[PDB]
Amino acid sequence: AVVKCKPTSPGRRHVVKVVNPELHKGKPFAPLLEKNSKSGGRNNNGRITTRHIGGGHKQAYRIVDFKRNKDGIPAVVERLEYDPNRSANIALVLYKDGERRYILAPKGLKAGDQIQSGVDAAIKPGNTLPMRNIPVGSTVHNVEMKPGKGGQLARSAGTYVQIVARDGAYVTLRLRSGEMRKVEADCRATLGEVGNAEHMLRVLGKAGAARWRGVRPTVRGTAMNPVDHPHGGGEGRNFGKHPVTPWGVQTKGKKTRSNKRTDKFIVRRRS
Amino acid sequence: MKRTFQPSVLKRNRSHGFRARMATKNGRQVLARRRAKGRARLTVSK
RNA sequence: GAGGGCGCUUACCACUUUGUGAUUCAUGACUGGGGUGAAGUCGUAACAAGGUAACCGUAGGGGAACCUGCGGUUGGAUCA
RNA sequence: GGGGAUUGAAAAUCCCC
RNA sequence: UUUUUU
RNA sequence: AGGACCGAACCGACUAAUGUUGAAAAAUUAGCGGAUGACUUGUGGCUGGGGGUGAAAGGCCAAUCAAACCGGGAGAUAGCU
RNA sequence: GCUCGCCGGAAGACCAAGGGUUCCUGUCCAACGUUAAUCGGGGCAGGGUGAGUCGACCCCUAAGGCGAGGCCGAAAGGCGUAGUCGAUGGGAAACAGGUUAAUAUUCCUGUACUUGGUGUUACUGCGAAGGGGGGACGGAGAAGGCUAUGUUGGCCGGGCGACGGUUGUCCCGGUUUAAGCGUGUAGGCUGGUUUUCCAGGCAAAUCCGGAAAAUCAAGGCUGAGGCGUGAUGACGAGGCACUACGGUGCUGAAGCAACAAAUGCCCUGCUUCCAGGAAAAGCCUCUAAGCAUCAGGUAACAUCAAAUCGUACCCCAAACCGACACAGGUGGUCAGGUAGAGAAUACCAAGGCGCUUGAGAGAACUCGGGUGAAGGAACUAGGCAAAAUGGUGCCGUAACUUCGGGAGAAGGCACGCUGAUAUGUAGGUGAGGUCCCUCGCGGAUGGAGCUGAAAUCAGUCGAAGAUACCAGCUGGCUGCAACUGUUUAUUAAAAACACAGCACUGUGCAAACACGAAAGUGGACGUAUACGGUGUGACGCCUGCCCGGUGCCGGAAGGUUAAU
RNA sequence: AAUUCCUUGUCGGGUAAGUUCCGACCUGCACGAAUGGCGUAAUGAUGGCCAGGCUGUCUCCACCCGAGACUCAGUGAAAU
Numbered sequence A: 001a002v003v004k005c006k007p008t009s010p011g012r013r014h015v016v017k018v019v020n021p022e023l024h025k026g027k028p029f030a031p032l033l034e035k036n037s038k039s040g041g042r043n044n045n046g047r048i049t050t051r052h053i054g055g056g057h058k059q060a061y062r063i064v065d066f067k068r069n070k071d072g073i074p075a076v077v078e079r080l081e082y083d084p085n086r087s088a089n090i091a092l093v094l095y096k097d098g099e100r101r102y103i104l105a106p107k108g109l110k111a112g113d114q115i116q117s118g119v120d121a122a123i124k125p126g127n128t129l130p131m132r133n134i135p136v137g138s139t140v141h142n143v144e145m146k147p148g149k150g151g152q153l154a155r156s157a158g159t160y161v162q163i164v165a166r167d168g169a170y171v172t173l174r175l176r177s178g179e180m181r182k183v184e185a186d187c188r189a190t191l192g193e194v195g196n197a198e199h200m201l202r203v204l205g206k207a208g209a210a211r212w213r214g215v216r217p218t219v220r221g222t223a224m225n226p227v228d229h230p231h232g233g234g235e236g237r238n239f240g241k242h243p244v245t246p247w248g249v250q251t252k253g254k255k256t257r258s259n260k261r262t263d264k265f266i267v268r269r270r271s
Numbered sequence B: 001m002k003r004t005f006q007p008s009v010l011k012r013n014r015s016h017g018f019r020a021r022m023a024t025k026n027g028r029q030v031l032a033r034r035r036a037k038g039r040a041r042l043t044v045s046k
Numbered sequence C: 001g002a003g004g005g006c007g008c009u010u011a012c013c014a015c016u017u018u019g020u021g022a023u024u025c026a027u028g029a030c031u032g033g034g035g036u037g038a039a040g041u042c043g044u045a046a047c048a049a050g051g052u053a054a055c056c057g058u059a060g061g062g063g064a065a066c067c068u069g070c071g072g073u074u075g076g077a078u079c080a
Numbered sequence D: 001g002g003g004g005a006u007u008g009a010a011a012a013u014c015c016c017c
Numbered sequence E: 001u002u003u004u005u006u
Numbered sequence F: 001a002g003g004a005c006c007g008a009a010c011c012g013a014c015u016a017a018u019g020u021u022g023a024a025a026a027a028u029u030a031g032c033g034g035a036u037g038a039c040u041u042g043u044g045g046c047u048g049g050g051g052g053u054g055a056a057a058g059g060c061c062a063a064u065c066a067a068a069c070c071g072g073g074a075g076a077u078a079g080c081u
Numbered sequence G: 001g002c003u004c005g006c007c008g009g010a011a012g013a014c015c016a017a018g019g020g021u022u023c024c025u026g027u028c029c030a031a032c033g034u035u036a037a038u039c040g041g042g043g044c045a046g047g048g049u050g051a052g053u054c055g056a057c058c059c060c061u062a063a064g065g066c067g068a069g070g071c072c073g074a075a076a077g078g079c080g081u082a083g084u085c086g087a088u089g090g091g092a093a094a095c096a097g098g099u100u101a102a103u104a105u106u107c108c109u110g111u112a113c114u115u116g117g118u119g120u121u122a123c124u125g126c127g128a129a130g131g132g133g134g135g136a137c138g139g140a141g142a143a144g145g146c147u148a149u150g151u152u153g154g155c156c157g158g159g160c161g162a163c164g165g166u167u168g169u170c171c172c173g174g175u176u177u178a179a180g181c182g183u184g185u186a187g188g189c190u191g192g193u194u195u196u197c198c199a200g201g202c203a204a205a206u207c208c209g210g211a212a213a214a215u216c217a218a219g220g221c222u223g224a225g226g227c228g229u230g231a232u233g234a235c236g237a238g239g240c241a242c243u244a245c246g247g248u249g250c251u252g253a254a255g256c257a258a259c260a261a262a263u264g265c266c267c268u269g270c271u272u273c274c275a276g277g278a279a280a281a282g283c284c285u286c287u288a289a290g291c292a293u294c295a296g297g298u299a300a301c302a303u304c305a306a307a308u309c310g311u312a313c314c315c316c317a318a319a320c321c322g323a324c325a326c327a328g329g330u331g332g333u334c335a336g337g338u339a340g341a342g343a344a345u346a347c348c349a350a351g352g353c354g355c356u357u358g359a360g361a362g363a364a365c366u367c368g369g370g371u372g373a374a375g376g377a378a379c380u381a382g383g384c385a386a387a388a389u390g391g392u393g394c395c396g397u398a399a400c401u402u403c404g405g406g407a408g409a410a411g412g413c414a415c416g417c418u419g420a421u422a423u424g425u426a427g428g429u430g431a432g433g434u435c436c437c438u439c440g441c442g443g444a445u446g447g448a449g450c451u452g453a454a455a456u457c458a459g460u461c462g463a464a465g466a467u468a469c470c471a472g473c474u475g476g477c478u479g480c481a482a483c484u485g486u487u488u489a490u491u492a493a494a495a496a497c498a499c500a501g502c503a504c505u506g507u508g509c510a511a512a513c514a515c516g517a518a519a520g521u522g523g524a525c526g527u528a529u530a531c532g533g534u535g536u537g538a539c540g541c542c543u544g545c546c547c548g549g550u551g552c553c554g555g556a557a558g559g560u561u562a563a564u
Numbered sequence H: 001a002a003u004u005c006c007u008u009g010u011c012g013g014g015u016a017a018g019u020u021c022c023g024a025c026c027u028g029c030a031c032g033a034a035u036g037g038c039g040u041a042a043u044g045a046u047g048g049c050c051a052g053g054c055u056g057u058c059u060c061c062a063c064c065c066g067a068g069a070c071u072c073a074g075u076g077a078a079a080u
């Protein structure tokens, strides 16, 4: 559920929260945690390598089972938590054999629900299953890319990949981005749409929110002086440049995409 | 006003200390130079 | 002496004063439309099947009447 | 612009300058 | 497509 | 509840006078902004020179920065004084 | 030595960082000291820092640093595995008093605590670089309990007034006590115990986890403070003695209560929110390889041990960074009395000070102030600067408005003291007594005593009662920018940057992009509801035409075209 | 007009008088749609303009309280 904030003060007037009751309150499941430590957007040579990264709240990491094995053993999702490291929500699961694990959080989620993964596995929202055994047309969560690896496609609040055709030993998928891409079919993949989706609708409302989210400000090239970024200068505003990256690297449609090594798998590019 | 020399022996030793000098081809070269000039205090100690 | 008057004092209150509002008349550079005016310009939308049937509601567009879109009406002509 | 056609006469339009 | 006033 | 209001600490630095061989190589005095936040601050760590860093001023990088400092090429070169 | 004055959330007092003998005593004065100097943070001697429990070393990890092998790379070297370092964080223990010229939680008195070795005696499955638990965690907010602390009285000792009064509802002061040990409260959290079973916990487990039943309702953690004890003592005004007039001996009164009360503590709690909040060791337990009369394990008592380094002094500064005995700079900890809303402020306490050139004079002029006839923005580029407003309560408050706002708009009235209602009220605290009781740090009923605003009425002094210090001026039009924010340390704080929001655009993950001739690494332990780039810059109404030129995308038929 | 040369544009308002202000026109030297356009409550040590209070800002100064300047003593510079 999303909420507007009364304007008892500017920098609140535009806020829009996305509050979810059915979330857990307070600390998460300790043993499934570990350190994180920010980076600053800086390398292992200490140089800023991605700009705009720094500050922001503390953040402890949840382990999150992506590969989804535990074949045969069902589980029962005890609750739904908040993960800080993703837009996605989280599901503490608990297996019959007495083992707990973190799993993403399909669109049905809900505590009480029953989960299961493996070739058998009944096709039900939130269950994992090599795609070979999944009706063509199904909508599918976090998708593995190489059978066994871990799942990497559609990990985000609201995402989902439709299977479109499975001729050959490969599946062809309609990614969220719109590209159509062949995949090994023996690749696992969870059922349903990834959880939340209200996400889109948040507003922040004030600079601070973003600040306390890890995002420093971005200074426009054109504000700078030539020596700094390819733009900038001119007595007052101006431009007359050819929109490029601060490293003279040309922009506005340049694709940069360059594989050959994975071309095959791309059936139809996004539009 | 706040001047530029804010003493600190921890950093002092860490940054220009004997072992830090000694911990690199070029530091080592510094000591060589000073020993060669006959300096009386290679690095700064107790 | 008692009482009284003058005075002083308290209440009520007329002028009068400050602040800020309501209302109403006259007024105003400039500006939008409306009405009137024997023979101006430009097109010619309606009246007949008015040469794209018309009109109402409504929204965008256009020197202008108006054009186009959507639903409704017939207060529409033809053996369609 | 001029000429003729066509108009009841204009305009448009066609042929001769 | 137009055909001044009474 | 709040980059909310008033206001010390604390962080800043809008006006003025004094100072200007100063008490001070940027301050004092009176007023001034912020003041639960994009707040402030201790210690320690990383980023190094056409390199860093920069809510961008060409600002900051040990009292200097349109390319630091130290040493060397080096008695650069100087149709100039 | 007597006064006077200044600071008193410091101009006091402690710690750190830094200094590094500046500390104490003598003694000297050239030079150092903005003068003299007899004095000094100067010279020269000499003295001075005493620890199981304060700190460090030390175990433990962070960021990050180093790194056998290793990958990389002309050489130099770059990066990383195991590991190994690194505190600003986690980890056993000591309080009160007394003493030196100068050291003390270190010496002495008194009284405690920690964990190890050895022994003896009973009682016993103990054991890992491993498993589990714990350690172990954000912000805001809201009271309850309490202590530190203070006020009044009681108590005790002392007092009876330089000038009218002052043996009483009078004056001054003191009225203090630690850890540890015992109790286990206010109050916070969680149902307990037993047996069976298991696809989990890299091996296993008697642990945790999961699942089954069975059986009890009260059980276990946690916890300020109080009370007791420590204290038979320490402290303690004041005495009585000696004095080499600095002080040294001996002695010793009362030593309670009510009220108020933190920003300390219970509270690593509670309620709640979102931005969702270190690691590891110690510690508890589980077992493995192991030892199985042993060895280890538990407990009480006895004993030995607890090293080494630091420990003077300056500390928001005359001892540090500022060339100086420099109005600058400098992290944390304490927090008394009256008035206050208060860590503002004014006056004081404890404590520390009068700023290391003075004496006169009492011009212009400059600096910093105080008052000002009439006038009152005439000033000037500009009301710069001055002047003015200045608390609380209550009534009252326009356009506009994104329905919060604008508002503290504006504008008014009240504000001292005394009496009364009420020799001190509403409120607050709460002792006797009475009873009850699962028995006391219990409950109830009780209202003594303590404490205490606010109102109204009535009276009264001055010119003036928010009587000082403190402490908004307000209003009307309009440019820009939404807003808080950021900026040219040192002539620019803004209309510049930023910004939430919008748009274009790239990126399918070994991503695009960036750091690096690489390995490696940031992006991201993310994955198109994400990540980069660029432009705009809240919100409202909206964003038209032009693809020639320049850039960019798509396109091959042909023409042209490199090495070969 | 943060854009406008001519320019103190012209009319309106305000003032005794107004090259600024506000309101209009529009003859836009040389506005205009995310090189965003045009509005906008609130915010602002932001620019422009007016009005009340208030005043040594000023007519036009005066007096007073302090620190220097001046004389004495000790020390004792500097720019040139």
Ligand SMILES: [Mg+2]
Binding pocket: A218
């Ligand atoms: Mg951006």
Ligand SMILES: [Mg+2]
Binding pocket: A223, A224, A225
């Ligand atoms: Mg610029």
Ligand SMILES: [Mg+2]
Binding pocket: none
């Ligand atoms: Mg310029």
Ligand SMILES: [Mg+2]
Binding pocket: A235, A236, A237, A238
């Ligand atoms: Mg320009």
Ligand SMILES: [Mg+2]
Binding pocket: none
């Ligand atoms: Mg009218």
Ligand SMILES: [Mg+2]
Binding pocket: C044, C045, C050
């Ligand atoms: Mg018609």
Ligand SMILES: [Mg+2]
Binding pocket: C052
């Ligand atoms: Mg028609």
Ligand SMILES: [Mg+2]
Binding pocket: none
């Ligand atoms: Mg129609």
Ligand SMILES: [Mg+2]
Binding pocket: F004
């Ligand atoms: Mg605020």
Ligand SMILES: [Mg+2]
Binding pocket: none
């Ligand atoms: Mg100041």
Ligand SMILES: [Mg+2]
Binding pocket: F007, F035
């Ligand atoms: Mg404030």
Ligand SMILES: [Mg+2]
Binding pocket: F064
């Ligand atoms: Mg500099």
Ligand SMILES: [Mg+2]
Binding pocket: none
């Ligand atoms: Mg050089």
Ligand SMILES: [Mg+2]
Binding pocket: F073
């Ligand atoms: Mg040469």
Ligand SMILES: [Mg+2]
Binding pocket: none
């Ligand atoms: Mg030369």
Ligand SMILES: [Mg+2]
Binding pocket: none
């Ligand atoms: Mg002398």
